[PDB]
Amino acid sequence: SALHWRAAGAATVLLVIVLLAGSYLAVLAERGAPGAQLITYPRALWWSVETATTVGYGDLYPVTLWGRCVAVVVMVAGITSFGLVTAALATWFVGREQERRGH
Amino acid sequence: SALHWRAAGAATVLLVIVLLAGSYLAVLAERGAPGAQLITYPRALWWSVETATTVGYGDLYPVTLWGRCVAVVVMVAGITSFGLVTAALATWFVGREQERRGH
Amino acid sequence: SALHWRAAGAATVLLVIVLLAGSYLAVLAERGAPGAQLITYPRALWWSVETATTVGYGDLYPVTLWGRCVAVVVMVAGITSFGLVTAALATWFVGREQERRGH
Amino acid sequence: SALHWRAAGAATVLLVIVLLAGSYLAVLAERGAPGAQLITYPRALWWSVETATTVGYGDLYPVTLWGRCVAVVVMVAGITSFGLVTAALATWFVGREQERRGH
Amino acid sequence: DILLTQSPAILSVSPGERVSFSCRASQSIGTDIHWYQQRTNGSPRLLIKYASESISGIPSRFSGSGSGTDFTLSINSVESEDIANYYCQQSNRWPFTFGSGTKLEI
Amino acid sequence: DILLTQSPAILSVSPGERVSFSCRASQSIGTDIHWYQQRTNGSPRLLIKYASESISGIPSRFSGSGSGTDFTLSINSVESEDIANYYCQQSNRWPFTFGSGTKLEI
Ligand SMILES: CC[As+](CC)(CC)CC
Ligand SMILES: [Co+2]
Ligand SMILES: [Tl+]
Ligand SMILES: [Tl+]
Ligand SMILES: [Tl+]
Ligand SMILES: [Tl+]
Structure with a gap:
């Protein structure tokens, strides 16, 4: 494991759920x-x-x-998710760069 | 506390204000x-x-x-805000990863 | 080299390929x-x-x-790519700031 | 100074120039x-x-x-710029969090 | 600016019958149409808003329908107190415009 | 709401000829049109969906075409069992609306 990657996974699962309930509720609200x-x-x-x-x-x-x-909920889910991957990518890169430098 | 989370909060409050004044001023300007x-x-x-x-x-x-x-102000508020959360998420992840490694 | 910059490069190449196959397959599917x-x-x-x-x-x-x-594939490619540069930019900045501070 | 903040500034100036030349060249190309x-x-x-x-x-x-x-140039300028601020914000936050922890 | 077209200008109906007033937009305006009533010597009186949302204080026999460019105000069982002029009003795009009006007559 | 216009209301054709029923939308609806068949005393019977997608269980001689506002249901070689009323239905924008119907006659 590792937190950052665990949050990315979580966020994906969550996203997939948000943008399904999303579709369902969108139709329900719009009809x-x-x-x-x-x-x-x-x-x-x-x-x-x-x-x-x-x-x-x-x-x-x-x-x-x-x-x-x-x-609005779908948008924020989408952004949060995708940002939480970018964050997780930096966390990773930053971890690695410190090894290259022997830190 | 912790700065990163404190800025996220701030940014949310700010955003909510920007995109209200936004609505109001948008109508005022567009009529x-x-x-x-x-x-x-x-x-x-x-x-x-x-x-x-x-x-x-x-x-x-x-x-x-x-x-x-x-x-333009609303857009930048929106982006700044959402970026300042992603930044805050990395800060967090990066803090944690260093513990996992015993740093 | 350096991982972060190597991933950015990779991601660009990949992107350019995704949004070509993209165009081709889009036409193929839509006609x-x-x-x-x-x-x-x-x-x-x-x-x-x-x-x-x-x-x-x-x-x-x-x-x-x-x-x-x-x-959907093009979108995610686009975002992943561009996020993986932002991540790579922080990694870089964060590496540098630690030198300024003599860390 | 500090690199991260210096790049943000740079990127803003650049952006303002890109999306002016942008407008000009857009009109020139589209007429x-x-x-x-x-x-x-x-x-x-x-x-x-x-x-x-x-x-x-x-x-x-x-x-x-x-x-x-x-x-395309305007888009990438826009994204690069705004990402390079988010990166710069994390760099900052990450620098600070390490002080809170006495690192 | 948006042109609202109320035809026919007069509507003659027997008491109790179902009646329908038309209002047509120069271009698609969604549901941003609103209905007013004006009795002889009286001020306008909001009846229906956004084409179909009812207004508190208005007989249940008042209703409305439509979307885009074609909109309709209806009265199920007409009666004396309904004799009035009926105007529609749009709030989709700026200026804000009224219909020429139509008169109900029993 | 979307208005569907089926003209002509009746269609007289000799056995075997190719026949085409028209359906026109009040505004562009993509391909969200669907075709039903109703024989005398019978319930409606989905024939074609999204303008051209065929339905399992329907003669191969049934087809459809069109996009936007003008749509067409066709029958290659007509025959007795085709004598019915034919309605079209749109699912582009809300309410959901039917066509006035047209009757095929051999
Ligand atoms: C380019 C027309 As439009 C996108 C289909 C209409 C919603 C954006 C104004
Ligand atoms: Co250290
Ligand atoms: Tl758009
Ligand atoms: Tl967009
Ligand atoms: Tl966007
Ligand atoms: Tl972004």
């Missing part, structure tokens, strides 16, 4: 709002990933309050 | 510009978050000079 | 789906970069399942 | 392409920032080859 486009499950999972990577194109987006809530 | 879409408070707060996470979909965006100024 | 816009090679490479930087504008995006798969 | 929307200076600077923060909404985007080249 009922006239004109809402984010209303079938499959494409709504693709919206989840898209959103979590902050690449948001605008083919799909939530229009209701709770959709947008779910949205 | 008066014909065709502007970013002109009610609630949705304009959703624009704030969206923007700060860099996920910008394009359901909403500022069209005036000052809207776009406010926009 | 055949009525209304699909992501169907010529040149612009589809521009879609690749756009996507990998998470700047996704929405001039172009995949509409099929496999397009979106390819998409 | 002449029928239907191109990215063709006046002011809004094209707003496109620059938007793009560099990866928040790309899709109110504006390059359509020509060289526009898209310029685009």
Whole structure:
């Protein structure tokens, strides 16, 4: 083990769960709002990933309050996750560089 | 305490303030510009978050000079904040890894 | 050498490959789906970069399942890569700061 | 001084230059392409920032080859810059945490 | 600016019948339409908001529907107290605009 | 809400000929159109989904095409068992809406 790598794993699992519950809850929240486009499950999972990577194109987006809530949670999950890998990569690199220098 | 975690907290509080003043000022700046879409408070707060996470979909965006100024401030707040957590996560991980190694 | 810089290089090479195979496979997957816009090679490479930087504008995006798969791979490649440079930059800075302090 | 903070400064200056030359060259490249929307200076600077923060909404985007080249340069400048601050923030935090621990 | 088009300008209905007023946008505005009522000599009276959300204090027989460019205010069982002018209003894009109005007549 | 427009309402064809039913959307809906069949006294019967994806259990002579706003269900060689009403349905934007229907007649 090692904490940093253990958090990355955790964060991935978590992410995969967040952006599934995400899809489900997005559809659940968005159906009922006239004109809402984010209303079938499959494409709504693709919206989840898209959103979590902050690449948001605008083919799909939530229009209701709770959709947008779910949205916000997905975004932060996406960022937190991906940042917590970058952090974990530095931790690793920094550990190694100290060996190269004999520290 | 610990500086890194104290800055993260700070940055969150700050962010929440930036993307509220953001919404308010966005509406204030955008009303008066014909065709502007970013002109009610609630949705304009959703624009704030969206923007700060860099996920910008394009359901909403500022069209005036000052809207776009406010926009720029929100973006940087969003990024700074989220980066300052990633930094804080590495700081933490790096602190820990040194214990595992008995350093 | 030095690991951190060696990973950055690696990650760049990898990225350049991912977002070429990306373009190719995107076109391959998207042609055949009525209304699909992501169907010529040149612009589809521009879609690749756009996507990998998470700047996704929405001039172009995949509409099929496999397009979106390819998409997901490109995004993660883009992020992983760019994060693995930030990590490598900290590793470097952190190495240096310790010299300034005579550590 | 301190390297990490000196690079952040540098990167900011650089960024400000990249996303000005960016605007200028974007207009220069895009005028002449029928239907191109990215063709006046002011809004094209707003496109620059938007793009560099990866928040790309899709109110504006390059359509020509060289526009898209310029685009790619702006994106990478934006990311590199903002990552090089996050790196610099960790470097700082990590320096400090070691004092708290008396290292 | 957004042009709202209320047709027909007059609506003649027998008491109790179901009635429907139309409002059309010059371009897609989502659900940012709002309905007001104005009785002779009276001020406007918010009836329905965002096309279908009801307002507290308004008869249950008032409802609304639509999205994008075509929107409809309905009254299930019409009656004397409904005789009024009916305007719709959009808040999608700036200026903020009203419909020409239509008059209900029993 | 999305308006689906099936014209013409009736289709008269000689046995075996190729036949084509039209369905038009009030606004671009991609390929989120679906085709149902209803024989006299019968329940609807999913024929084609997302405009062109075939359904297991449906004659090979059934096909479909189109994208955006204009969509078409076709039958290569028509025959008695095809005499029915044909409806299309969209799942692009919420409400979910049907077409007025068209009747095939040999
Ligand atoms: C303004 C972004 As778009 C409409 C949401 C993305 C499909 C048009 C480029
Ligand atoms: Co030491
Ligand atoms: Tl982004
Ligand atoms: Tl983005
Ligand atoms: Tl976008
Ligand atoms: Tl980032």
